[PDB]
Amino acid sequence: MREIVHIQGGQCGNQIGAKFWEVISDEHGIDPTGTYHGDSDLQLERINVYYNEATGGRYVPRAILMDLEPGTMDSVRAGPFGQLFRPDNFVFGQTGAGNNWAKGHYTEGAELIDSVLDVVRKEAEGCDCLQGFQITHSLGGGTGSGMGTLLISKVREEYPDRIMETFSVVPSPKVSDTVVEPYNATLSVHQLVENADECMVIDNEALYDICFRTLKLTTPTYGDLNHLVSAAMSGVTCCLRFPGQLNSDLRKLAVNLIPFPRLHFFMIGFAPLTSRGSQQYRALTVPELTQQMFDAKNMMCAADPRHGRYLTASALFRGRMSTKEVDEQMLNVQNKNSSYFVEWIPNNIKSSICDIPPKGLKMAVTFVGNSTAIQEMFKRVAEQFTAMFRRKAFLHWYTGEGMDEMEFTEAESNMNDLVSEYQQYQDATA
């Protein structure tokens, strides 16, 4: 009943999903053996969105774990909450991609992806009425960035009217992990802009900055980063699972946030986030939540929104609060920051209220914003890519198994066209 399936790809995607499912199970009161031990009735009335019913009274997540090397999935199967997943849903290759977009999209993706399409079909149309798909992956890794986007293409072709959502991790050069990042990042962006309905960008640099500054903890870990990402993911779809004053689902959010068909790259942030020592020095109130929400540093991207203009903004509030206060705060912010809001879109913030807060918290907010500042990421990635591609560095590895330089030229042209089109509306006047 308007449920959404989960497909995670690559090492990064598997690490994201292994924590997201733990967070969801904790929220819904599902034990690691799959037996419900909750405290109220509201925890089971919409449990069908993310889970399936099996014999014996246990629940199984409707997730599909696909990858090219079995090491990551063997690691996540032995961890806590690793017994929930159906062992059939594990699909793996034998050779891997080796951080090669060409290998992950042409030479092993074509051979393997048939089985994962079969399992995606089974899980998706075994449902009552599908709501959409959500994907977690990173654009810096070969197998993920290629096979996941080919999966996006085929799934979109087979389901043209469904909602497609992706949580993308964009590689930053300040903290770089792969010397071949620009190539596969550009190719993935080109293949994604044509198909994906919604895309969100996450940056490990911004995650490190948040963990060091706000939480004020000495040594962050990928567990902590995955925890922030999982909280952000659950915040978006909480309203689809719990009753609220103003209900709003993924399709509503997309319709209200996407002005033009090709502008679907958002950035997200979460609030409140306070350190342990100063956790109770603050007071949970709507003005404090909204100021920490609209704080530029709190955003999960290195793209500074103060360098551009917000096309639209979205705020999903969790808890019990007064709609008059929420609307007054939104109007006050939109009036006090008139410069950063493009003028031909009056009242350009959407608001929502959900009565069930995250566990352990009384008030929490999920923010999704589309601002003209993300073009800096595209410009920098294109600059690095063209610098590398001028001298034909690392080109033979990609061209040895099917591609030609014409597709790279087309990717550059499309990427620059996207940049120009997206910066066009920044200086537009009414």
Binding site: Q245, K252, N348
Partner: protein
């Protein structure tokens, strides 16, 4: 032997319907399970229908394309009141998209809804009209509401329909595309509804904050005011009064021309128990609060235009002679001016049942109250600002691709703009003097 059928569509309509049905049940003394307590009849026949032994069934139907709000009703304390098959729910919401709720999904529910409407109407003998509630800024509210009105018109004919719409506020807003679906919905309802009431949300916030002394009003507080307004409007049908006014005595006294049937509302007194008993609340003074411009329930200032007509209702222990003196005083007052071709512009109704107080609510218990429904030329401003907003949005064709691909042609927006411009011209030429 007089009946009326109420239609609730959309989340806002369902939310306000819950409050108004709670109010009606409390006023008629029926328990939430439907059973009469303990052991003067036909006072409930206007809204309810006897099952022949004991319990009652409301004459209402609940509509929505998303079950989040509907399933709450089937689980709450009122699960035994409503008939299980008149709370109609869909599977996929319109998602603030007028096209989805008027061309794609709304055409699969309308047949079942009309079947339910027939099954409710064939059991009544004196139906004065239909009451339809909807919030205009949402997809399914605008879409299913327009389709419902279009089908009911052809299927019934001359039966009166009353729409208590909720236009978006001038500057306070929730969604961003809601200017778009307001224009099409207004164009649809203009030639299909008989009486429309303007109930935008921003004004009710100001009324609450100023009178009830609430610094954080919520949607629950607003719905109680609208429920009280509906109760005051419809009490003349089901309670004995000195000067009764039926539903059909609105379309003979309030709308001078067929195209002009948009009108505002005002209620008084609205007061809290902490300061309710410091004044006598005489009929002479409560009628001043009704015409006080800041007390209008819609964010429109009557001081910017002429008054066309005013139909206003009293309830309590009011005496007809006292009403006449207050009306004479108001007419003597110079700040309020009427059109020249309307020498007499007041329709007054008097009822005996005092306004019932809801336990756990906000309003106090008062012996007298007045509900005022006015028609004035000042309503032209609400459409002009919305027209400007829609023009600003449509100048370079934003958000349009979310409507074209769902069956609506490109040129539909142009026709609605012409309708709005013609409507404004009609108000201007009506308001001009001779």
């Amino acid at each position: 032997m007089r009946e009326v059928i109420s239609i609730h569509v959309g989340q806002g309509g369902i939310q306000v319907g819950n409050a108004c049905w709670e109010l009606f049940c409390l006023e008629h003394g029926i328990q939430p399970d439907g059973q009469m307590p303990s052991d003067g009849d036909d006072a409930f026949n206007t809204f309810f229908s006897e099952t022949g032994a004991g319990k009652h069934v409301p004459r209402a139907v609940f509509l929505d394309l998303e079950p989040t709000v509907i399933d709450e009703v089937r689980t709450g304390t009122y699960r035994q009141l409503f008939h299980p098959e008149q709370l109609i729910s869909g599977k996929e919401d319109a998602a603030n998209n007028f096209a989805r709720g008027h061309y794609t999904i709304g055409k699969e529910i309308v047949d079942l809804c009309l079947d339910r409407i027939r099954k409710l109407a064939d059991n009544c003998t004196g139906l004065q009209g239909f009451l339809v509630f909807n919030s205009v800024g949402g997809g399914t509210g605008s879409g299913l509401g327009s389709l419902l009105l279009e089908r009911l018109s052809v299927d019934y004919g001359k039966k009166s329909k009353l729409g208590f719409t909720i236009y978006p506020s001038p500057q306070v807003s929730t969604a961003v595309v809601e200017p778009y679906n307001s224009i099409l919905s207004t164009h649809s309802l203009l030639e299909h509804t008989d009486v429309a009431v303007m109930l935008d949300n921003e004004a009710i916030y100001d009324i609450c904050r100023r009178n009830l002394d609430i610094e954080r009003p919520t949607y629950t507080n607003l719905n109680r005011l609208i429920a009280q307004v509906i109760s005051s409007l419809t009490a003349s049908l089901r309670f004995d009064g000195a000067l009764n006014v039926d539903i059909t005595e609105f379309q003979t006294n309030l709308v001078p021309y067929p195209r002009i049937h948009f009108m505002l509302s005002s209620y008084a007194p609205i007061i809290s128990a902490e300061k309710a008993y410091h004044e006598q609340l005489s009929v002479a003074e409560i009628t001043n609060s009704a015409f006080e411009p800041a007390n209008m329930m819609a964010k429109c200032d009557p001081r910017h235009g002429k008054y066309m007509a005013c139909s206003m209702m009293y309830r309590g222990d009011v005496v007809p002679k006292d009403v006449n003196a207050s009306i004479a005083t108001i007419k003597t007052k110079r700040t309020i001016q009427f059109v020249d071709w309307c020498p007499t512009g007041f329709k007054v109704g008097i009822n005996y049942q005092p306004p019932t107080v809801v336990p756990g609510g906000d309003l106090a218990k008062v012996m007298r109250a007045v509900c005022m429904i006015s028609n004035s030329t000042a309503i032209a401003e609400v459409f002009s600002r919305l027209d400007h907003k829609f023009d600003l949005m449509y100048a370079k064709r934003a958000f349009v691709h979310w409507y074209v691909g769902e069956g609506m042609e490109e040129g539909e927006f142009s026709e609605a703009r012409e309708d709005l411009a013609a409507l404004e011209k009609d108000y201007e030429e009506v308001g001009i003097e001779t």
